[PDB]
């Protein structure tokens, strides 16, 4: 019967949100965790052990894998999902201590609205900034043959990627998820400002 | 003794369903999870490391595995089981907030029936649409010898698959499960419309 | 103190069973799960990576492993243990809803006996049918040298199996478990019919 | 506060045991599980992939590993620990139903002593029978060089084992554990018979 | 309802801290655990099996990997996160016993402030000392080609690293986390001394 | 609210200990488990698959790894941590039954002090005995080149170890932990004897 203290903590955090934002934003978080943790994490398993190059030079497969992939795609999407969830965990931990100082005062407007807007504003800056770095570094597809011009390799060599079509399907799936997540946070910002 | 609040939430969600649909649709969900997570997930383990081709050309096994399998079968069935379960989780989260706004009103018809029909209708569209893509791309069997005509391979080569008979048994098992699941949702749509 | 509602659900399911069938049939289920999940699952680990053949032909080890093993033994025993446990989970979910419709009627013979006999009858049909398929396809032992006559292999080749003696010990262990499980369900059918 | 129903079930099972047998027999069970599950299970990891033989014949390493090891040592000790724990789980499940038929009779000598002696007698028969099979098949040490005379190998070959000294240390550790466990069950049989 | 004894233990430990140090220091601990346990732990997987050298000498890849990496980066960051968390667990276990001796005295200033300052002072000494060892041994980047002059290698050889650019991104991420963590503990020391 | 029966069992076990031994001995147990289970367990992963020797003789790497390492270092430290924790689990299980026989006597000095001293005395004998075996067999460092003179190897060969410097850092970390743990148990023996 000690679960009624959890119903008060969920009510204070979701006090300024709309009725349809509590539903579509929480199920989209579970969609992001299960898809990234089960399906897309194992396609990127043999990303280096199946990368091959057409050369005899020792040391040319180490430096040509590293020029193609400066950071992996599944470790760029894990860093992305933490930065967008930190302003929610920071604001949820802030309400818990505010409700504690006042609970031990009754037994013995304008403050919690400003900190709600700054947390929603930073979840949208982090979503746009991580989409522009990927558009600049990689793009939104993958080709099968790479052409490498590093050292110690002589002139130019041809190198071949591992599963370049299955990975392109999951790059476009994670683009639509982050564009729907960005559009639901802008609706949250518009409803608070245009109300009062 | 705090488990009697769970009996009220299960009663509201299953208010418009028949007596025999609550049984056959929930045990078929557990049948889908245990079969996919234990038996069929490990047959697809060495799908690329045991794919061989009859050539000396460097880079011909990378591009001929990718032409045969644009997406794996076990990652197409994980994406399928999430899309069919999202309209159930969206409707279950909608009833929880509707029962909350009314509970804090009594202590201090036509709305929940329309949203039930749209959730059942989308679980049947997602089952038919995922069956037509697999019929167009793959079929419903697998052969042992593949013939590949990509580049950099010269003319045509012969490539050999890993366990093509054991995988054909599990392709037909997952076809019958999705055809029984589609037939139980059409009976649900017919009982609601022909009642009132 | 909310565990006394579980004692009522266990009493209704086991109302038509004998006194000694509640003990010997539940410990035999745990014996089947722990033996299959710990001991026999890891002997079948390198079943393909240690299969060798005496040839130089590319593609002859792929097609001669697949002719020998159309389905693995540990994935045939996982499919077997689900089919025999589905009529128990279907009948246990049926009693839970029958006790719910009557509980909300008292606060605001001939039906549950017919569905008990049909569930016990289907656990014995599924045990006999899975034993006859294995007797027809495989047998109840394994030999060390296999002789293969598929294509692209020339004439006939010799192929060698991985651990053929340790696997034969566990084939006979899982045969005696399914013959004791079949004999305890026939005693259950004989006691219900010859009582009344 | 619903944990006081567990204190009654533990008191009925341990009613005929001595004061010092409840302590030394339960901690020795945890010693057997943690040692077998953590330390000895990973020494037997590369038991086949590091077995080598001094030959060029294809198929001679498959048949000479199998002649040396008809069953592995870590899968013979998992089968041993289940057979000795089954008479304890069968007797513990028997007391739970006997206390149930009598509890629903008071709210609406000579029987449980005979079944206690038969369960202790079978834990000692299973400990002696598993020690005599290992003395006949293997012994209680391991040598480094094996000499194999099977087919298709020509005449006799030399084969070399993986970690034969570290495995000999753990064979003697599991011998002393099963000899102390056998001696504590004979003291239990002597105290019940010589009391009354 | 037995969770109200946890609210008293959390209040005594955080009695001398500021209002904004309870929030920013606890979420930064979770940021350190999830980033180190999911993203950076798997980039360091094939650190030795993909290290290559341009030589034919047997034994030159063993001694040139060991000269480059005297201790791995992911095992130096696990040792770092335990040493900084030990003074928090030592002080939290000290308050629990102090509240116990006084609770069994009421039912049948200057002591807990000195031990709080010494625990905060040791979390800052351990953060600075682990940053100076890494600056002396490694630096804060990684290059792609290493030049090795050990024995048995003849003269000098060239050796090539595995993913030297992706690892450099995560070295700088874990530097900023430990510099923000060091700056939040110095603010804690300044607020206690300048208050009273 | 059923957690107040755990506060009585913890009070009886720690009745003869000092105030500062309850803190420093329990956090040092958690330091031993997390360090051994996370950091040092994975450095010893490729201990045999990266051991190389400068020979062409078949069977010389099997017998020269086994002469160098008669038992691994991480399996000698798991056996060590169980033997030192068995006298604590034996004494904790002894107090639980002594408090049971007396609880069912009140509702329907000199005994528990002798058994406390014998349990502390055996935790110090097991710590000294495991340190002397390692000093005799191995030492407290590891060198990079080993010289082997077994059979079937001709004359003498050179063999090379895997990570001999990172392992030497963790050998000295586990030496200081067992010397601090031995010094805290001797202080416990001195305080009981010199009190009364
Ligand atoms: C009675 C309130 C229960 C609170 C449960 C939710 C925890 C909120 C996050 C953790 C805050 C405290 C960290 C120590
Ligand atoms: C009165 C009930 C309080 C609200 C409980 C909500 C539970 C949220 C935490 C568990 C979420 C796990 C996914 C469903
Ligand atoms: C019984 C309901 C379970 C709902 C699905 C949860 C699946 C979690 C799997 C995550 C780990 C995947 C490992 C392959
Ligand atoms: C060596 C050439 C310059 C490196 C370019 C790659 C930079 C990638 C930056 C990715 C940062 C992602 C986390 C913010
Ligand atoms: C490769 C496995 C992916 C697992 C995803 C982990 C993401 C964790 C999200 C945590 C959200 C809270 C951040 C403070
Ligand atoms: C001051 C406590 C409440 C904080 C509200 C959330 C603020 C969001 C800050 C996000 C900054 C992210 C930096 C990594
Ligand atoms: C090389 C051809 C690649 C074809 C890309 C197909 C991508 C389909 C992804 C579907 C995304 C829709 C999300 C709702
Ligand atoms: C090769 C790149 C193809 C990109 C096509 C997909 C663009 C996404 C448009 C739909 C986004 C939906 C936002 C709500
Ligand atoms: C008292 C009601 C308990 C509700 C438990 C079921 C949770 C329903 C899904 C989670 C909804 C709340 C998400 C924060
Ligand atoms: C009054 C009881 C409420 C209904 C409880 C149903 C439990 C459903 C959640 C757990 C399902 C796990 C598989 C059985
Ligand atoms: C490069 C040739 C065209 C690619 C054909 C493969 C398309 C596969 C589409 C699978 C989509 C499955 C998720 C909807
Ligand atoms: C390869 C392991 C398969 C595990 C299956 C995971 C499926 C998860 C289903 C989740 C249903 C809820 C979706 C919102
Ligand atoms: C509005 C809240 C209730 C939603 C009911 C379920 C609607 C189903 C929508 C499914 C759309 C799936 C898109 C991926
Ligand atoms: C190459 C021959 C393949 C034979 C296919 C056999 C498929 C049997 C599957 C049984 C499915 C029945 C589900 C109830
Ligand atoms: C090679 C493809 C063979 C397909 C045969 C199986 C067809 C499935 C018919 C039975 C479906 C049952 C639906 C209830
Ligand atoms: C009060 C009754 C508790 C029932 C617990 C056992 C659950 C029975 C199986 C699950 C049936 C409900 C599925 C949603
Ligand atoms: C009154 C007690 C109800 C019966 C409880 C039986 C528990 C069965 C579920 C847990 C089984 C786990 C293996 C012992
Ligand atoms: C403490 C009682 C435990 C009883 C034995 C349970 C062992 C479960 C092991 C199953 C996983 C095996 C992984 C090797
Ligand atoms: C290609 C030759 C015919 C295939 C024979 C193998 C059939 C195996 C059927 C196994 C079915 C097991 C699940 C019912
Ligand atoms: C290879 C691991 C074996 C694990 C056995 C899993 C068997 C699951 C049995 C589930 C019984 C209920 C079926 C509806
Ligand atoms: C109608 C609800 C009760 C069902 C009782 C059990 C019937 C057993 C049916 C088994 C059929 C198995 C088909 C896969
Ligand atoms: C090639 C010789 C194989 C010998 C077979 C031995 C099988 C013993 C199995 C014991 C089964 C008894 C179950 C109680
Ligand atoms: C090579 C096959 C040998 C089979 C011998 C074992 C036959 C099993 C007879 C005993 C079964 C016990 C049933 C209760
Ligand atoms: C109130 C009694 C609780 C019993 C808990 C111990 C369970 C005993 C073993 C399981 C017996 C019931 C199996 C369904
Ligand atoms: C009155 C207390 C009943 C006895 C509780 C004993 C617990 C035994 C089950 C848990 C054992 C786990 C290892 C300690
Ligand atoms: C915190 C007390 C834990 C007691 C030791 C339990 C260790 C269990 C480890 C079993 C799995 C081993 C995997 C390497
Ligand atoms: C093929 C030569 C005869 C086989 C001898 C090996 C028999 C091993 C029997 C082990 C049985 C252990 C489980 C009872
Ligand atoms: C290789 C992992 C070893 C794990 C040991 C599992 C032993 C399970 C013992 C179960 C005792 C109850 C038997 C009915
Ligand atoms: C009849 C219910 C009580 C059983 C008491 C324990 C008897 C022990 C029988 C052990 C037989 C083991 C055969 C595998
Ligand atoms: C080849 C030399 C092997 C030496 C065997 C040493 C065995 C020591 C085992 C100690 C067992 C004692 C258990 C208490
Ligand atoms: C090579 C075999 C050596 C066996 C020596 C060990 C014999 C065990 C004697 C001590 C047993 C202790 C029983 C309580
Ligand atoms: C009633 C107080 C509950 C305390 C829970 C927190 C435990 C504090 C750390 C453990 C201290 C005791 C170690 C045996
Ligand atoms: C009155 C509530 C006491 C405070 C509860 C705080 C819970 C902290 C322990 C669990 C933390 C897990 C991460 C949220
Ligand atoms: C053999 C040459 C001297 C070794 C230099 C490497 C010393 C690394 C010390 C790292 C200590 C980190 C834990 C404190
Ligand atoms: C490689 C996996 C990393 C997991 C991190 C473990 C860190 C444990 C921190 C424990 C803090 C308490 C120390 C006493
Ligand atoms: C005396 C009990 C309270 C201790 C307070 C914390 C003191 C911090 C000591 C840290 C020393 C770290 C040595 C490894
Ligand atoms: C070889 C070029 C490496 C480029 C380094 C880029 C490092 C970016 C790390 C961003 C750290 C910011 C933390 C907030
Ligand atoms: C090659 C090394 C580059 C280091 C540049 C980063 C220095 C970090 C400065 C910002 C630290 C923020 C502390 C709050
Ligand atoms: C009411 C007392 C609860 C006891 C919990 C601690 C268990 C002590 C170790 C287990 C002893 C009983 C083993 C069956
Ligand atoms: C009155 C509170 C009793 C003492 C509780 C101590 C808990 C010890 C067991 C859990 C330890 C886990 C590591 C903190
Ligand atoms: C074959 C040469 C004699 C063997 C010497 C190695 C003995 C190692 C004994 C280690 C015992 C550790 C557990 C007590
Ligand atoms: C390799 C993983 C190490 C895990 C350590 C397990 C140690 C278990 C300690 C158990 C203490 C109780 C012994 C009776
Ligand atoms: C008699 C019950 C209390 C036992 C107290 C602890 C005695 C310590 C005995 C340790 C012996 C270790 C032998 C492996
Ligand atoms: C070959 C040179 C090895 C250098 C050894 C350095 C060991 C440092 C270990 C620090 C241990 C201190 C524990 C507090
Ligand atoms: C090569 C061996 C070097 C050993 C040096 C370390 C000796 C440990 C002395 C400090 C021990 C601290 C005990 C409290």
Task: Print the SS3 string covering chain F.
Answer: CCCCCHHHHHHHHCCCCCCCHHHHHHHHHHHHHHHHHHHHHHHCCCCCCCCEECCCCCCHHHHHHHHHCCCCHHHHHHHHHHHCCHHHHHHHHHHHHHHHHHHCCCCCCCCCCHHHHHHHHHHHHHHHHHHHHHHHHCCCCCCCEEEECCCCCCCCEEEECCCCCHHHHHHHHHHHHHHHHHHHHHHHHHHHHCCC
- Residues of chain F whose beta carbon is less than 8 angstroms from a beta carbon of chain E are 1-3, 19, 22-24, 26-27, 30-31, 34-35, 38-39, 42-43, 46, 50, 52-54, 144-145, 158, 160-166, 169
Nearest-CA distance E5 → chain A (Å):
13
Q: Is the CB of F38 under 6 A from ligand 35?
A: yes
| A2: nearest CB among E3, E46, E145 | E3
Rounded to 5, what percent of chain B is helix, strand, coil?
60, 5, 35
Cβ B58 under 6 angstroms from ligand 11: no
B-C CB pairs within 8 A amount to: 69
Q: Which residues of B touch C89 (CB under 8 A)?
A: 27, 30
**Strand residues in E27-149 grouped as ranges (E):** 52-53, 145-148
Cα–Cα distance for residue pair A70/A77, rounded to 1 Å = 14
Strands (E), chain C: 52-53, 145-148, 157-160
Structure tokens given for A17: 């949100």
Angle at Cα E100 formed by Cα E95 and Cα E105, nearest 5°?
A: 130
**Interface residues of chain C, partner chain B, Cβ below 8 Å:** 1-2, 5, 48-49, 58-59, 62-63, 65-66, 69-72, 75, 78-79, 82, 86, 89-90, 93-94, 97, 152
CA proximity to F175, closest of F45, F101, F77, F94: F77
DSSP state of E140: S
Task: Please compute, for residue B25, the number of CA atoms within 13 A of its CA located in the half-sphere on the CB side.
Answer: 20
Which secondary-structure segment (H or E) carries A137? Answer: helix A114-137
Tokens standing for residue C116: 């008990």
* DSSP helix/strand/coil, B191: helix
- Residue A39 and residue B75: Cβ atoms within 8 Å? yes
- F22 CB neighbours in chain E (<8 A) are 97
* Structure token pair of residue B62: 């990378």
Residue A62 to residue E19, Cβ atoms within 8 A: no
- Which of C131, C134, C167, C179 is the best mutation target for the ligand 23 pocket, counting ligand atoms within 8 Å of the beta carbon and taking the most? C179
Of ligand 2's atoms, which has the minimum distance to the CA of residue A6?
A: 3
Cα F77 to ligand 33 centroid, rounded to whole Å: 34
Atom of ligand 32 nearest to the CA of E8: 2
Closest approach of D64 to chain C, Cα-based (Å): 10
Ligand 45 within 6 A of F169 CB?
no
Q: Which residue has the tokens 């980047």?
A: E141
- Closest CA to ligand 18's atom 10: C38
- State how far residue A21 is from chain B, nearest Cα, in angstroms: 11
Q: Which of A63, A66, A82 sits opposite E35 (nearest CB)?
A: A82
Contacts of F46 in chain E (CB under 8 A): 48-49
Residues in F closer than 8 angstroms to E5, CB to CB, are 3
Stretch (H or E) spanning A148: strand A145-148
What SS3 class is residue B160? strand
**Contact partners of D by the rule of 3+ C-beta pairs under 8 A?**
C, F
**E85-107 burial, b for 16+ CB within 10 Å, e for fewer?**
ebbbbbbeebbeeeeeeeeeeee
Distance B176 CA to ligand 15 centre (A): 6
Closest-lying ligand 27 atom to the alpha carbon of residue D79:
13
Which residue has its alpha carbon closest to ligand 12 atom 2? Answer: B37
Number of Cβ within a 10 Å radius of residue A1: 9
What string of H, E and C letters represents the secondary structure of chain D?
CCCCCHHHHHHHHCCCCCCCHHHHHHHHHHHHHHHHHHHHHHHCCCCCCCCEECCCCCCHHHHHHHHHCCCCHHHHHHHHHHHCCHHHHHHHHHHHHHHHHHHCCCCCCCCCCHHHHHHHHHHHHHHHHHHHHHHHHCCCCCCCEEEECCCCCCCCEEEECCCCCHHHHHHHHHHHHHHHHHHHHHHHHHHHHCCC
Q: How far C140 CA sits from the closest chain B CA (Å)?
A: 20
User: Which ligand gives the minimal distance to the CA of A138?
Assistant: 4
- In whole angstroms, what is the distance from residue B106 CA to residue B114 CA? 24
Query: Which ligand sits nearest to residue C186's alpha carbon?
Result: 23
Method: cryo-EM
Instruction: For residue B53, give how far its alpha carbon lies from the nearest alpha carbon of chain C (Å).
Output: 8
d(CA A143, ligand 7 centre) in Å: 15
The pairs formed by B109-112 with CB atoms below 8 angstroms and a separation of 24 or more are B112/B12, B112/B15
Which of A147, A176, A144, A148 has the alpha carbon at shortest distance from A160? A144
Up-side HSE of residue E117: CA atoms within 13 Å toward CB?
11
Selection from F84, F90, F85 nearest residue F128 by Cα: F84
- E in contact with C (at least 3 C-beta pairs within 8 A): no
Beta bridge partners of C52: C160
Across the interface, whether the CB atoms of D66 and C38 are under 8 A apart is answered: no
Contact F166, E69 (CB under 8 A): yes
From E168, E170, E171, E178, give the residue whose CB has the most ligand 37 atoms within 8 Å, as the site to mutate.
E168
In this complex, do E70 and F165 lie within 8 Å of one another by their Cβ atoms?
A: yes
CB E83 within 8 A of CB E128: no
Of ligand 20's atoms, which has the minimum distance to the CA of residue C86?
Answer: 14
The CB of F6 under 6 Å from ligand 40? The reply is yes
Mutate to test the pocket of ligand 18, among C30, C36, C38 (most ligand atoms within 8 A of CB): C38
- Going across the sheet that includes F145-148, the strands are F52-53, F157-160, F145-148
Nearest chain C Cα distance for residue B52, angstroms: 7
| C-alpha F96 to ligand 39 mean position (Å) | 7
Q: Which residues pair with A147 in a beta bridge?
A: A158
- How many domains in chain F? 1
CB atoms within 10 A of CB D71: 19
The ligand with the least distance to the CA atom of D92 is: 24
Tokens describing residue E39:
């993203």
Q: Report the nearest-CA residue for atom 7 of ligand 30.
A: D169
To what resolution in angstroms was this structure determined? 3.1
CATH of the domain at F174: 1.20.1440.80
CA D120 to chain centre: 15
Cα atoms in the Cβ-side hemisphere of radius 13 Å centred on F110? 0
Rounded Cα distance between E45 and E22, Å, is 35
Could you say which of C35, C53, C162 has the minimum Cβ distance to residue D82?
A: C35
Q: For the beta carbon of residue C85, count every other beta carbon within 10 angstroms.
A: 15
Contact F187, F42 (CB under 8 A): no
Listed as own residue / partner, the contacts of E80-85 with beta carbons closer than 8 Å and 24 or more positions apart are: E80/E126, E80/E130, E80/E178, E81/E32, E81/E33, E81/E36, E82/F31, E82/F34, E82/F35, E83/E126, E83/E130, E84/E123, E84/E126, E84/E127, E84/E181, E85/E29
Domain hosting residue E40, numbered range: 5-194
Chain E residues with CB within 8 Å of chain A CB: 1-3, 19, 22-24, 26-27, 30-31, 34-35, 38-39, 42-43, 46, 50, 52-54, 144-145, 158, 160-166, 169
Alpha-carbon separation of residue B175 from B23, B60, B183 (angstroms): 21, 33, 13
The rounded Å distance from CA D23 to ligand 39 centre is 12
Give D79 Cα–ligand 28 centroid separation in angstroms. 8
């Amino acid at each position: 019967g000690d679960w009624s203290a959890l119903g008060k903590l969920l009510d204070k955090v979701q006090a300024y949100s709309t009725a349809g934002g509590k539903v579509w934003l929480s199920v989209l978080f579970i969609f992001r965790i299960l898809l990234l943790g089960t399906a897309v994490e194992s396609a990127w398993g043999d990303e280096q052990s199946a990368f091959r190059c057409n050369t005899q030079q020792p040391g040319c497969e180490n430096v040509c894998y590293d020029k193609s992939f400066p950071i992996s795609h599944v470790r760029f999407w894990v860093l992305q999902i933490i930065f967008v969830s930190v302003p929610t965990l920071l604001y949820l931990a802030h309400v818990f201590y505010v409700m504690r100082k006042e609970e031990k005062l009754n037994k013995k407007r304008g403050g919690l609205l400003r900190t709600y807007i700054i947390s929603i504003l930073f979840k949208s800056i982090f979503e746009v900034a991580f989409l522009l770095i990927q558009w600049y570094i990689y793009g939104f597809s993958l080709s099968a043959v790479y052409t490498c011009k590093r050292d110690p390799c002589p002139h130019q060599v041809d190198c071949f990627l591992s599963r370049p079509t299955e990975k392109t399907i999951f790059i476009i799936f994670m683009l639509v998820v982050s564009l729907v997540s960005l559009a639901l946070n802008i609706i949250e910002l518009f409803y608070v400002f245009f109300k009062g």
